[PDB]
Design a protein around this ligand. Sequence first.
Ligand SMILES: C[C@@H]1O[C@H](O)[C@@H](O)[C@H](O)[C@@H]1O
Length: 413
Amino acid sequence: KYQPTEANLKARSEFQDNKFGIFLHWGLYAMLATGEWTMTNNNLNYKEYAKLAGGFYPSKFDADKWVAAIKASGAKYICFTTRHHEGFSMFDTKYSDYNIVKATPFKRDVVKELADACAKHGIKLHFYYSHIDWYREDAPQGRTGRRTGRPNPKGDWKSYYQFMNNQLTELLTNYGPIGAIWFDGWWDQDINPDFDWELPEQYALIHRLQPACLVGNNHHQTPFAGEDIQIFERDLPGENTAGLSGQSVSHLPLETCETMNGMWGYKITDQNYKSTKTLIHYLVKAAGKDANLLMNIGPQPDGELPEVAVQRLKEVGEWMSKYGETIYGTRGGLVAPHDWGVTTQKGNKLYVHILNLQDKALFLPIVDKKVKKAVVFADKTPVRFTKNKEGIVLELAKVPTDVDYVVELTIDD
Ligand SMILES: C[C@@H]1O[C@H](O)[C@@H](O)[C@H](O)[C@@H]1O
């Protein structure tokens, strides 16, 4: 069965170490500015929808600007939608003329420009790839895309499968080293429990071209053999407030994805961006649950990242410059997430992230381990603490009102 290589295991460790990445959802749907599900939500004819590519020209696109804005947040990788459910390829593929170079006046391989900029800024680059397709006539139809006017609902699974494997070969050979392939769409065939996605062969292909490329699949299931990371959508592992994540937590590297407003693709009615404080909290709570955070922006049809999104990124980076040592290269801390906050850990250090506390003292259930030292991370002032039957009790100088009041504990062994 699945034997992950030494390189793959190293890449899993580096992934868990980086903690924070940015999701970019960009395609033809940015013209419509009503969301990447609009083609199926509105039952748009597939040929009519394809006509939009003739008017696609994000004149202000600047991959360098994007990646500099993203790096100023402290994020270490980008996950970019190379091709979403709409079926439009944002890269110069030779297996379909329905792509940004051939089909639009822009005539520019957006994916290549991104990969170059990412390489220049030392930001790893992951590729989102859609297992389902609402445009191609050989794509089989599950629950979505049943009213786009296509002629063969059953599709030609052999043709379409060969097409995906050839495009993945393109993406893995032409754009230098690729952090991960992020598959999505599996849930589209869940109504058909016998649907054979032929995943062993595809994962084998990916690992055969680049053995350190991680493989994820947003299937909301217990991971399948050959996957290298587990995806939780709009929820933290073991949580299910958004209704998409009832699956158990595995021993694979965990990653949570989330939007900065309410949608993945650019939405012109939706300018309700979460505060900087909410965003830092998402990141820290994820780290405290031993998971990465993948935070999304939907770029505009003129090619600029939304301005408010960029300012949020800038302010999150201002916080990260001060507190990143408590997040980077850590794992889920020895003390489970509580209502007051979370803990992370690295070496002999356990970081207590006090996010939400009304008191001037905090009880921690640390029994076996001995707490050798306790200081305020920000300036290294003492934290008095007393042992008791069930743990320790920190005595704080004030009721914390910071975004994250971090106390650094040194433990033995
Ligand atoms: C990552 C998100 O998860 C869902 O399954 C997708 O269908 C959304 O459009 C988005 O890509």
